[PDB]
């Protein structure tokens, strides 16, 4: 227990649900947050640190280059552009695209990551697990870029999960959600939920820690008011994940 996954060393603000615009998060209250950047250095997608050498993200983010040398990672950050001194910049060595759906990808760090109180992995869930309807979760990221104040600061929003059965009703996603994905948001009195980046994390607290339940989808991850967002349902891929880390 000298820094276990899912346990932040800075209690998260835990922005209430439906708060317009979301909230700027407490710095380092989401130590698994990753910032996927290009060689030149520009931030462009999110990631979740799952172990000292592995970052989970969205395949779509890798569309431009297959060369893992074209990607860098930023760990422990809060500011999007101007970076702090403690920030950890690790280059990527290999890329692992999930075979069955090609939606998420695994990033292996050229060198491990010094686990500190600002850089702690998130906990993966149990294989094939299904987060119950209404469970309160959080999305975090630098996804929103239209605000004039606070531009660049890591933000968070609270989203309760929507049972796919409901999520797929005509009024909502109308049958577009596979069992391999989950939904989160509000169906009433809700607001924009676009703070997370594509590939960004969607974690849900359980008993005493934060478990990574979904990866913010490319495009459909950013939902408008009263429309739920769509995340890749991580539990449906833990096995594959565990295996990749275990063999590389």
């Amino acid at each position: 227990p000298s820094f276990d996954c899912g346990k932040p060393q800075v209690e998260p603000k835990k922005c209430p649900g439906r708060v317009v615009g979301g909230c700027v998060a407490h710095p380092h209250s989401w130590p698994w947050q990753v910032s996927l950047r290009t060689r030149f250095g520009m931030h462009f997608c999110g990631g979740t640190l799952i172990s000292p050498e592995w970052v989970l993200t969205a395949a779509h983010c890798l569309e431009k280059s297959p060369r893992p040398s074209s990607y860098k990672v930023i760990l422990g950050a809060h500011q999007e552009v101007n970076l702090e001194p403690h920030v950890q910049e690790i280059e990527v060595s290999r890329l692992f695209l999930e075979p069955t759906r090609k939606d998420i990808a695994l990033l292996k760090l050229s060198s491990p990551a010094v686990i500190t109180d600002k850089v702690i992995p998130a906990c993966l869930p149990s294989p094939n697990y299904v987060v119950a309807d209404r469970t309160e979760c959080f999305i975090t990221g630098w996804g929103e870029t239209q605000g004039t104040f606070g531009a660049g600061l890591l933000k968070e929003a609270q989203l309760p999960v929507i049972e796919n059965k409901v999520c797929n009703r005509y009024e909502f996603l109308n049958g577009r959600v596979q069992s391999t994905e989950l939904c989160a948001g509000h169906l009433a009195g809700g607001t924009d939920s676009c703070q997370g980046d594509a590939g960004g994390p969607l974690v849900c607290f359980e008993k005493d820690k934060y478990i990574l339940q979904g990866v913010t989808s490319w495009g459909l991850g950013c939902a408008r008011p009263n429309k739920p967002g769509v995340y890749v349902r991580v539990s449906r891929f833990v096995t594959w994940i565990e295996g990749v880390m275990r063999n590389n």
Binding site: V19, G21, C23, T148, F149, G150
Partner: protein
């Protein structure tokens, strides 16, 4: 009955650049929208300077907020801009604040900018 402004591109031209302030408020807790009749702020520098100060804008907004309280409305205390807040030119280009929360707007050309989005607020007491 509150009628919002027109899009910058539709408004009549001016000869003294100004900031159109059309924001709504969000009651912390209930998250309900509070409509405020839009107002204007004059600019002169780079009249409020062309280098605006967050705390200033919020102060203008707070003043306007209590100037429109009708018999049935209650008083609200401006808390801060929601991450929602955005200042744009007539084309939709966004201007960003610095670390000290200061936004700096072009001196020339002369034009108007728009400040929209929400302002977090709580009922005064």
């Amino acid at each position: 009955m509150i009628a919002g402004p027109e899009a910058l591109l539709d408004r009549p031209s001016v000869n003294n650049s100004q900031l159109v302030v059309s924001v709504a408020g969000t009651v912390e807790g209930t998250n309900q929208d509070i409509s405020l009749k839009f107002f204007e702020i004059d600019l002169t520098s780079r009249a409020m300077p062309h280098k605006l100060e967050k705390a200033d804008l919020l102060k203008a907004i707070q003043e306007q907020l209590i100037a429109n309280v009708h018999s049935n409305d209650d008083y609200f205390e401006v808390i801060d801009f929601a991450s929602d807040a955005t200042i744009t030119d007539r084309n939709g280009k966004v201007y960003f604040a610095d670390k000290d929360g200061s936004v700096t707007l072009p001196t020339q050309p002369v034009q108007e900018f728009l400040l929209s989005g929400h302002v977090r607020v709580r009922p005064y007491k």
